[PDB]
């Protein structure tokens, strides 16, 4: 297919910045191929001089040359291996960086639709397989092709009537190798499917351990697992038998070709057309070719899978996001007035199934606006679309008589901030998490945010102060500290619009009395989302909405 | 089996002995053409070499087949026993360990016997060259073992750094709404770039180590070959060794090199696989008479975490009973003791005049049935997932009658393909009321003498609760069975013959529903709330 050729062209364009390393590696490869081609000729000339009369000059010259060629081949092979390994690693690192940069620009709907494990497989092992195409597979393929051509040239130089027999014999070996490779691949993927089916049983058993323990059906589960194990064992036995039969066939064919070469070589020897060293070098050349052909077939088979993995990674990368045009606006001063004009929103995950319909209200800088009602957790949609996370299908949300799509990303998300019911924490320091997303923030701002959100209680004890190391995803803190750090993180930016989710239902009462009654709520629009009427004890403008419609 | 392994050992010894005839006979044939022999001898060696090598290949095939057929059985039995042991208290590890150990042991034994036989024939051919090879073996092949440790250290540093970078990227991607809300995509890109920049230097070290390792591992063998060829040439000049013997040694040295290389490349993997492996009376009939006397139990974590104490609940046969109270009542321990899922740790208990563990396991599990607090359905059909654990397959009419009694007939009929409807794993796609009805049907299909159905109203609806109340309270003479319903539906607790409340692991109240609601117990406090 031309698609595979396009993929190879894209891979070459990716590997383009590593030109000098690849040139040096190819030159080292050529030197190694020449050295290992020329070694057995002198290895046979040593036997040639040893068999007949003794001449010290020829023996010394032959052993010196052979040692020199062996040393040169070893040195160049080591250099080629090092250069190719470095090139492969550089390619892997570059494509990992490019893939992460491309992935970070996609819309949230793609991340909701696509599971995390697929992205991890793309970024962990699938990106590694494409880095073995040029520095590994093309390397061994080219070296095997050139080695085979040179070896057959030398065998034709030695004796054509002995080379023609190998030429006739090789297609049988090629066909047998291809058939065995196809059968092995088929059996291997069947074995993988069977072992996945076997692991499904133990996953089901460990998932529902309480049920089976209550009903005492342990023997039934172990019988199902025994049946799955027998099904896998039959496939394993078939694979082993096929591999053993292939090895037996290969050994018999090697016997036949060796006997034919020996018989014809001795028949030509009796006419004086060959020497013992010539025959020995011919045996070494035949033994090398018989392995290099199979190496070539295996390497092509692996190159196909490498190209497939590269196709998967490139398909994952080349997705075009559905975000609107980037916004160039960013005023020095923002009033904070927000208007929704019949915004109507439907989730892109389930299109034509609207969640919001004809919503319309206005927000004031000095008036506190609260939202009430269960809504089936549908109140988070207006909070998400208020930060330009999801573009509205109908209507329009606007700030200061300007639509939200025309504002600069950093400026808009620095002027309008929000906290959810569940805070999300990273693996950095407390200072890192407080100043998250900030280009430069002094420790004084962190102190102000911590004392304004009443975090300094827990933070003061914290070893190494604020420079402590939080656990992964906040594993070293409880829910109260998570909420305190989240509200301090929101407060540290001095936002013109502040949105809170569950300010009293989930968040502490002290934080609700602090953030909603300080200077950050004196001249800034605050949108608090609560499922109860307790927020009515301080709210000014209360809005209730159910099933996508406002009362 | 030891006998089959011994037979495989005999077969592999014979095959390794017979394989080596090719270089010996080609060297003898070159010597034969050197000294003007006869054609009868020539065809004799040709036929003998062909027969020996063919027999070696055939015996290799037979021995392999026997070894693989036995090791498959061994691995399957080990996996089954591991699963059976872990269920009455990893499997993928065990399977990978089993198959890797199998192939490693096969390669190790094959190449060890081949190397031993090769050493034997080479020593028979000429003492001097074999002694030289033996004395240059370890002093020249210890260096790959020295370099491989540094290489493995650098390579494992590479993989752990890559894994850490991948974990950082995955953590950044999993929290994408927060990153988009704080506009910190460039920060995550910068962190990823810093991780790769930290990787790069060590990676260069790894490349240099690869170059040095390849240099050493080729130069050692090449120098060994050069030295053995020079010594053989000097000896054949001296005349103590024939030239054909030199050809045989030239052909044998390469095979010995491959054998020792395979052994040294195999042994550490075998060692680490071994290190990974080192870590591993039936009752006739009953009326449902269940009685307790000061019964106590403890949590499985530690005996200090007491579950309950002083339990004397008398499950009246042919009547219902409701257990209420706060979380300190320990009704879960009472349910576990009724289902005999946990051993008692104090007091006395009896089921139909006999202790519950004293009876047969299958009979006790089939008689004293229970419904789980969280309903779950296994990944099977509704004719199986609603009859799991049954000794005999129920009839379709019987299963339909059970579903009708449990109210699951409509759910089964609405599903496609009738009773053979596909169900998701662990009841993921099933509704809460449907799952509760399926659990009730699974409990009622065994015709229990006592029902411990509780906590099913958390996911059930009002109609399901009304159906459960109609099945329980309005049962004909309770179907000659008892009940221990401890569900959260307080409406059905009023219809119970004798409700009770407990606190702190001990009973706190009891009596009739009106008496309990008029007393000072926890049930009255909940009613007055």
């Amino acid at each position: 297919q031309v698609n595979n050729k396009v993929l190879m062209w894209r891979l070459l364009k990716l590997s383009r910045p590593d030109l000098p390393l690849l040139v040096a590696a190819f030159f080292f490869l050529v030197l190694a191929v020449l050295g290992e081609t020329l070694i057995p000729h002198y290895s046979g000339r040593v036997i040639d001089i040893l068999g007949g009369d003794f001449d010290p000059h020829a023996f010394a010259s032959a052993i010196f040359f052979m040692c020199l060629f062996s040393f040169g081949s070893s040195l160049s092979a080591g250099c080629r291996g090092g250069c190719f390994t470095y090139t492969m690693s550089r390619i892997n690192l570059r494509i990992r960086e490019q893939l992460f940069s491309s992935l970070l620009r996609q819309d949230l709907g793609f991340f909701q639709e696509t599971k995390t494990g697929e992205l991890n497989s793309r970024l962990s092992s699938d990106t590694t397989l494409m880095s073995n195409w040029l520095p590994l597979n093309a390397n061994v393929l080219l070296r095997s092709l050139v080695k085979v051509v040179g070896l057959y040239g030398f065998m034709l130089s030695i004796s054509p009537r002995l080379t023609l027999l190998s030429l006739l014999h090789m297609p049988f070996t090629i066909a047998a190798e291809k058939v065995y490779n196809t059968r092995h691949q088929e059996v291997l993927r069947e074995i993988q499917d069977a072992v996945a089916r076997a692991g499904q049983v133990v996953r089901e058993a460990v998932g529902g351990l309480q049920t089976v323990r209550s009903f005492g059906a342990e023997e039934h589960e172990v019988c199902r697992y025994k049946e799955a194990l027998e099904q896998c064992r039959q496939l394993y036995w078939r694979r082993d038998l096929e591999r053993a039969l292939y090895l037996l066939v290969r050994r018999v064919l090697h016997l036949g070709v060796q006997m034919l070469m020996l018989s014809c070589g001795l028949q030509q020897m009796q006419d004086g057309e060959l020497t013992q060293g010539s025959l020995l070098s011919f045996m070494i050349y035949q033994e090398s070719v018989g392995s290099y052909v199979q190496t070539l077939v295996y390497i092509y088979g692996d190159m196909l899978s490498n190209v497939g993995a590269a196709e998967k990674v490139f398909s994952y990368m080349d997705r075009q996001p559905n975000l609107p045009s980037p916004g160039t606006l960013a005023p020095t001063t923002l009033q904070g007035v927000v208007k929704f004009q019949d915004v109507s929103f439907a989730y892109p995950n389930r299109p034509d199934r609207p969640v919001l319909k004809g919503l319309t209200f206005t927000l004031r800088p000095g008036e506190v606006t609260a939202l009430v009602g269960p809504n089936g957790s549908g109140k988070s949609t207006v909070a998400a679309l208020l930060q330009n996370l999801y573009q509205p299908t109908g209507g329009q949300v606007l700030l200061d008589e300007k639509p939200i799509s025309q504002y600069e990303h950093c400026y808009l998300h620095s002027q309008v901030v929000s906290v959810g019911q569940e805070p999300v924490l990273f693996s950095g320091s407390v200072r890192n998490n407080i100043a998250y997303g900030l280009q430069s923030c002094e420790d004084d701002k962190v102190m102000a945010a911590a004392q304004a959100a009443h975090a300094d209680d827990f933070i003061q004890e914290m070893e190494h102060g604020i420079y402590t190391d939080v656990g992964e995803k906040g594993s070293q803190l409880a829910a109260g500290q998570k909420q305190r750090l989240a509200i301090a993180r929101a407060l540290v930016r001095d936002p013109r619009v502040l949105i809170l989710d569950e300010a009293t239902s989930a968040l502490d009462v002290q934080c609700e009395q602090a953030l909603q009654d300080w200077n950050s709520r004196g001249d800034r629009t605050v949108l608090v989302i609560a499922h109860r009427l307790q927020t009515v004890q301080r709210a000014h403008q209360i809005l209730v909405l159910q099933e996508g419609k406002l009362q | 089996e030891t006998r089959r392994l011994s037979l495989f050992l005999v077969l592999v010894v014979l095959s390794s002995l017979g394989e080596m005839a090719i270089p010996f006979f080609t060297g003898r044939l070159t010597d034969w053409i050197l000294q003007d022999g006869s054609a009868d001898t020539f065809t004799r060696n040709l036929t003998l070499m062909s027969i020996l090598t063919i027999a070696s290949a055939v015996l290799e095939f037979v021995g392999d087949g026997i070894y693989n057929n036995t090791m498959g059985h061994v691995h399957s039995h080990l996996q089954g026993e591991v699963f059976g042991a872990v269920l009455r208290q990893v499997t993928e590890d065990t399977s990978t360990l089993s198959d890797s150990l199998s192939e490693n042991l096969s390669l190790f034994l094959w190449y060890l016997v081949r190397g031993l036989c090769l050493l034997g024939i080479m020593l028979w051919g000429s003492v001097s060259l074999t002694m030289v090879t033996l004395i240059t073996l370890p002093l020249l092949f210890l260096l790959p073992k020295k370099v491989g440790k540094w290489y493995q250290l650098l390579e494992v540093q590479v993989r752990e750094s890559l894994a850490k970078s991948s974990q950082v990227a995955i953590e950044a991607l999993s929290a994408m709404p927060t990153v988009r809300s704080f506009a910190n995509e460039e920060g995550e890109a910068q962190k990823f770039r810093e991780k790769l920049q930290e990787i790069k230097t060590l990676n260069q070290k790894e490349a240099v180590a690869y170059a040095v390792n390849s240099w050493t591992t080729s130069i050692s063998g090449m120098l060994l070959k050069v030295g053995i060829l020079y010594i053989g040439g000097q000896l054949v000049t001296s005349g103590a060794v024939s030239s054909g013997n030199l050809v045989t040694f030239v052909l044998y040295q390469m095979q010995f090199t491959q054998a020792v290389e395979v052994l040294l490349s195999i042994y550490p993997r075998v060692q680490k696989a071994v290190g990974s492996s080192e870590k591993i009376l039936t009752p006739l009939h009953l009326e449902g008479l269940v009685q307790f006397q000061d019964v106590s139990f403890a949590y499985p974590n530690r005996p200090d975490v007491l579950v309950l104490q002083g339990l004397t609940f008398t499950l009246r046969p042919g009547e219902v009973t409701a257990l209420v109270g706060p979380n300190g009542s320990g009704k879960s321990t009472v349910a576990a003791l009724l289902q005999n899922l946990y051993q008692p740790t104090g007091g006395q208990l009896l089921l139909d005049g006999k202790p519950l563990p004293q009876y047969e396991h299958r009979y006790l599990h089939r008689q004293v049935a229970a419904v789980g607090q969280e309903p779950q359905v296994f990944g099977r059909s509704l004719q199986e997932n609603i009859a799991y654990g049954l000794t005999q397959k129920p009839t379709m009419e019987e299963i339909t009658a059970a579903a009708v009694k449990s109210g699951a007939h409509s759910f089964i009929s609405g599903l496609p393909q009738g009773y053979d409807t596909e169900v998701d794993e662990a009841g993921s796609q099933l509704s809460g009321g449907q799952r509760q009805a399926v659990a009730l049907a699974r409990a009622l299909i065994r015709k229990p003498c006592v029902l411990i159905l509780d906590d099913a109203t958390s996911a059930l609806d009002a109609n399901s609760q009304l159906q459960v109340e109609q099945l329980l309270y309005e049962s004909p003479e309770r179907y000659s069975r008892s009940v221990l319903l401890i569900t959260q539906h307080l409406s059905l607790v009023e219809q119970a013959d004798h409700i009770l409340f407990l606190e702190g692991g001990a009973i706190r109240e009891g009596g009739t529903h009106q008496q309990l609601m008029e007393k000072k117990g926890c049930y009255w406090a909940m009613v007055q709330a």
Partner: peptide, 9 residues
Amino acid sequence: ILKEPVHGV
């Protein structure tokens, strides 16, 4: 059996 050829980088 036999050790399949590795033919590394």
